[PDB]
Design a protein around this ligand. Sequence first.
Ligand SMILES: CCCCCCCCCCCCCCCC(=O)OC[C@H](COP(=O)([O-])OCC[N+](C)(C)C)OC(=O)CCCCCCCCCCCCCCC
Ligand SMILES: CCCCCCCCCCCCCCCC(=O)OC[C@H](COP(=O)([O-])OCC[N+](C)(C)C)OC(=O)CCCCCCCCCCCCCCC
Ligand SMILES: *[C@@H]1O[C@H](CO)[C@@H](O)[C@H](O)[C@H]1NC(C)=O
Ligand SMILES: *[C@@H]1O[C@H](CO)[C@@H](O)[C@H](O)[C@H]1NC(C)=O
Lengths: 146, 146
Amino acid sequence: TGSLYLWIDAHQARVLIGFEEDILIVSEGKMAPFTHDFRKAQQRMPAIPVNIHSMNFTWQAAGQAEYFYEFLSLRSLDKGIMADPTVNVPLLGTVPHKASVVQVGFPCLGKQDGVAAFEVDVIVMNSEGNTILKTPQNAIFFKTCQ
Amino acid sequence: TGSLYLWIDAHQARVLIGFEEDILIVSEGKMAPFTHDFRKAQQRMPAIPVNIHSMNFTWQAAGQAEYFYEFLSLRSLDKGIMADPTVNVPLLGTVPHKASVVQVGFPCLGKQDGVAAFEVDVIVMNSEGNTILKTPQNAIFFKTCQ
Ligand SMILES: CCCCCCCCCCCCCCCC(=O)OC[C@H](COP(=O)([O-])OCC[N+](C)(C)C)OC(=O)CCCCCCCCCCCCCCC
Ligand SMILES: CCCCCCCCCCCCCCCC(=O)OC[C@H](COP(=O)([O-])OCC[N+](C)(C)C)OC(=O)CCCCCCCCCCCCCCC
Ligand SMILES: *[C@@H]1O[C@H](CO)[C@@H](O)[C@H](O)[C@H]1NC(C)=O
Ligand SMILES: *[C@@H]1O[C@H](CO)[C@@H](O)[C@H](O)[C@H]1NC(C)=O
């Protein structure tokens, strides 16, 4: 079975949706069932509130197999409202064996007000160079800036 | 300055060309000057002899920076003479900090006789996901099979 995990820790989840419980995105190298019908899932995703400037994701490659991630696109679609989203990790790297936090930042410029559309396109490859996991095609996320 | 190195060790070089001296291919992340005019370099490259079944390449990422390699193509163009070239490393991985040997195998089938054309297309990427080194475009190598 797969060894990859991606989740939002209970504390971060509490700050985001009010419920203090881990939000599983990938478990044992498999996308969580709520993400399969992605367009339906995006409707239950509100625009990231003004109080949140960054979000903590936790990931791990829990076994002996090596996995490589790559951020293909970190792009704001409303550059006048928010600058490009950021990550505190190199764009290309290894998924760590020890569970580690990736901080995704949403840099509202303050020179305007509104909701900024943005992309976080990431892929995970195995040691054969095959893409085994990735941000659903054409996924768009939103950040409320004031 | 760069930290990547790729070379053919003096012992392997002796077996291949008769001269016992390291053959530098990449030094400090830069392609060796003999490879710049690649078509001229390929003329000084004879078809790998019948006595050699595999070749040892030595590589290292000598610094703190992480580098990722990927074998994009390991392909025989004469499948009736030689099967696809092989490597004893995963197709996608990290360039090791400790100098390590990659064994490239040339599996002559023995069901025929002649010279087999083949490709070894490899890329090296930095932590930003940019290709910084790669097999020269359209490079072709040859293996004498009997
Ligand atoms: C560090 C990478 C972050 C890569 C992704 C970075 C995207 C950055 C955008 C952040 C926006 C996320 C929050 C959206 C606003 C919000 O409040 O949404 C809550 C959501 C949906 O969760 P929910 O509303 O709870 O839905 C029900 C699921 N239950 C309840 C059953 C657990 O909570 C979420 O589930 C958020 C999901 C965001 C990710 C969707 C898919 C990404 C898949 C990438 C796969 C490749 C990587 C695999 C790695 C092993
Ligand atoms: C493990 C990867 C092997 C990746 C490449 C695998 C290719 C497999 C094909 C093997 C065929 C190589 C032998 C050809 C037959 C032969 O006898 O050639 C000798 C050659 C040329 O060397 P020379 O004849 O000595 O030329 C003069 C150079 N002086 C003398 C100044 C040092 O000796 C050679 O220099 C061989 C050069 C073969 C490689 C050419 C370019 C590859 C660049 C890849 C860059 C990306 C990777 C960077 C990594 C940090
Ligand atoms: C995000 O992680 C950082 C570093 O561990 C921590 O300082 C911060 O409190 C975390 N945020 C939330 C909302 O849990
Ligand atoms: C290639 O490397 C292997 C493993 O270290 C060794 O057994 C073999 O003798 C080497 N070949 C040459 C020609 O040096």
